[PDB]
Amino acid sequence: RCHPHDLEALRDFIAHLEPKPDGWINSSSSTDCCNWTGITCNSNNTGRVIRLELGNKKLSGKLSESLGKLDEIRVLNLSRNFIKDSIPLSIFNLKNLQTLDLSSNDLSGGIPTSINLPALQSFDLSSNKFNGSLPSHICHNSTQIRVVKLAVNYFAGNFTSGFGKCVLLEHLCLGMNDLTGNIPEDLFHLKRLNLLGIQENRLSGSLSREIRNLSSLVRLDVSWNLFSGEIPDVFDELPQLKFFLGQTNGFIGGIPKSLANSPSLNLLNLRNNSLSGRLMLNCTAMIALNSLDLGTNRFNGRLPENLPDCKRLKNVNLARNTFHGQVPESFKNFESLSYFSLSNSSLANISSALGILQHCKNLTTLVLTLNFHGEALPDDSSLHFEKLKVLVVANCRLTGSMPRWLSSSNELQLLDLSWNRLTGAIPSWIGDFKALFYLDLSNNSFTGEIPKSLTKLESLTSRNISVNEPSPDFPFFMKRNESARALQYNQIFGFPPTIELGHNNLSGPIWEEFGNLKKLHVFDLKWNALSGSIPSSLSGMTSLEALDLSNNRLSGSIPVSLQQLSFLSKFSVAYNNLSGVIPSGGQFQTFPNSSFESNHLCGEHRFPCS
């Protein structure tokens, strides 16, 4: 038997919410509230209600005003439900409420102009429908507040002054709203703040030098705003800074000396800014740096020779910059290097690059695309990359043959050599990589037949090959042609298992044994010299989604068995020698005429047509 006041308040609360939780089915009868689901009391369990924690209960409805009658409640947690409409005023007057988590519901409207919650520690409204002015006036009566989480709301208007009066504020999360203007100078009074997310708003102006006043910062997320100007060179004042996220802004200048000297930074992401000049870090000074993303900037000059002196730097993305010259010779010592993305950086001497980089024994994923333009792909067979998983060197217009030194990387998972000038036959050892699920050799000069060993590729047949996906900190992008919008893959295993051989000079038949690859999603043979019959055994490729045979010289008929490919949504035989009926119904009726054009193929009952 509990207090009549709590009993009442709790009965009204649940009157507005469905479903009734497990222990609340007795609610209108039962007098023992403290043993209801998600309720806690003082004394032992036997006093006033101090905690109402109903998070992730699938609760649907509105909040009762009589929630404000629980005088002793220190913790109110309704997060991860379907609760909607307004927050009752009476909730903002609870004298004992330490912890308020309303995050992730459908709540809307606005916060009252007058709030008195003297005991409040953490305040979490994130992931809701709240708009309007930021409730910075909460600082007046909650002098103890540690945590304000407002992220993922509709707050627009100025980033409003007044948070600086929450003197003990530690976490402040404003991310993913519509805020405009610069950071109120008010904010720079919070000397105990260790987390500032402002990311994904419309904020702009320079990032003030007054930021040196927030000396407790650990994580600074400024990403995805309109900031510009130089990054202020204050970072010796922020000795605890571990994560700095500035990506997708208008920052200019280089990396400030103080940031380039910070011993505490784990992670620096400045990608997609307006940054420029020589790239200078003092790697003797940055002993915590494990991850560096400078992509889509204008850094120029040579690649900094001292980079391997960051003994912890695992992840490096320098892509889409203005460098020139070769990979420094010191990169032989980059012992920590795992993921190295150099795409589109104007690098020279792929020969030196590969001969140096083979000495980095932790290298797993390497992206060299759009460098070394017109160079000759090194065939030199002392090259050995032992732990290599992902190798992308594409659209470099490279010359030579398929390099056999590659055959010794047994871990290899994804290989993209496409859009080069490579020539000669595709060698048998390409079928020997057991972990390879993706290979793009397309748009080269390759000749000869298709090696039969592609039919016994292990990751494309059985399910008994199992390996760990590489985990670089950057996404990968995929372009079909020069004017196509790109596709994004955050993880390597997001790529469909793929054999892409199109636009080469390959000849001979399509092996019946391709019916062995049960796990292949994409088979692209288009724009080759291939001939013979389309094998009926292809109906055995059970995971097949896209089959492109177009622009070859293939003869005979489309085998009916192909209609047993359950997942095939994308098919073309156009520009071949084929004849007869296109198989009716099922899967093939969904393909457009263009899939069969420039053949002698006709729809059923239409033969001959032309």
Partner: peptide
């Protein structure tokens, strides 16, 4: 072709 940025 695959690229990175």
């Amino acid at each position: 072709y695959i690229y990175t940025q």
